[model samples]
Target: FMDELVSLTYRSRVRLADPVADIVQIMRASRVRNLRLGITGILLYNGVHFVQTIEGPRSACDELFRLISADPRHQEILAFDLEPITARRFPDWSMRIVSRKELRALAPDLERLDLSGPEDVAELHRTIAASLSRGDA
Candidate 1:
């Protein structure tokens, strides 16, 4: 199947009382969708913003975008960019979440706190891919 990935940033207008709880619910719902559509990847949430990477068939990815657009927890959503990748980055990760602190350490000088740089993004893609492949092997 042809693979594609979309990256986007979202902000919450009101302070999220329990971000972890909110994220857990979102992730559970996303996992069900991913399982149905054969999609995989990771999501990162800072205190105020969210950065997510989704990879799958183009149609599945589009469906994910539609769901995210309608999700209530997300507001002021601005899809800064999207990258159509040739290969699956996190084929084994159905849905993974990482803390902002972890992301910051991964790319110390990232200009937009909401998005990852091209190099860092590619690196992360490779890192996750390698991990998946090795685990499968």
Candidate 2:
């Protein structure tokens, strides 16, 4: 009977000089912190951008988002979608890292990333779901 869960998605532009290790460290910290608040999420890295989708209690999600907004590692951080959710898409993961490696491998160099809107997010969700249904590769 819990109706307070929400799925919050945001995109941010990571600094050009930012090291991957540093951003990954922030992600690791988020895993611990989010797990404590019953949050599960996916963090996607598309070279120059980061798209994070956090799902959990509205209060906790909002709080975590505020913290994310304050982090100076990235610029132009903005939340594009905030949909209320029942359960989490990533229940087993506190922070699931989804990189563009596979896709980039499919189309090297010039494949422009398209994680720019809610529709793209829906497509991502479908892709993740299908892969999960198809079992581990």
C-alpha TM-scores of all predictions:
0.72, 0.82
> lDDT of all predictions, in order shown?
0.65, 0.74
Candidate 1 ranges with C-alpha deviation above 4 Å: 1-15, 116-136
| lDDT for residue 108 in candidate 2, whole number 0-100 | 38
Global CA lDDT computed for model 2: 0.74
lDDT of each residue in 4-53, candidate 1, tens digit only? 45443333332356887987788788888888988878776656666567
lDDT of 2 by residue, 11-126 (tens): 88877465668767887798799989888887777777777888998888888899889888888987778998767787777887777785354333322434644367776665
The runs of at least 3 residues in candidate 2 whose Cα sits more than 4 Å from the true structure, single-residue gaps closed, are 1-3, 16-18, 103-118
Best by lDDT: 2
